Amino acid sequence: SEYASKVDEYVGEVENDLQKSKVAVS
Numbered sequence: 001s002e003y004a005s006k007v008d009e010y011v012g013e014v015e016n017d018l019q020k021s022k023v024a025v026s
Helices: 011-021
Strands: none
16 A cells, blocks of 8 residues: 555655654764
């Protein structure tokens, strides 16, 4: 289901997570 559909629809949230995970280092 979310194998190639949600991949793009959820991309926004992925980016959000990334932002936090690696916030261009301290």
